[PDB]
Design a binder for this molecule. Structure first.
Ligand SMILES: [Zn+2]
Length: 32
């Protein structure tokens, strides 16, 4: 049931694994 469904504003990428959410969540940050 998508144990990793990030819910960040402007998001649109579901996940099933864990690390993915970790490498994906840190993306909502980015520099600049
Ligand atoms: Zn996200």
């Amino acid at each position: 049931d998508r144990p990793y469904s990030c819910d960040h504003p402007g998001c649109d990428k579901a996940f099933v694994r864990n690390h993915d959410l970790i490498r994906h969540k840190k993306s909502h940050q980015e520099k600049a």
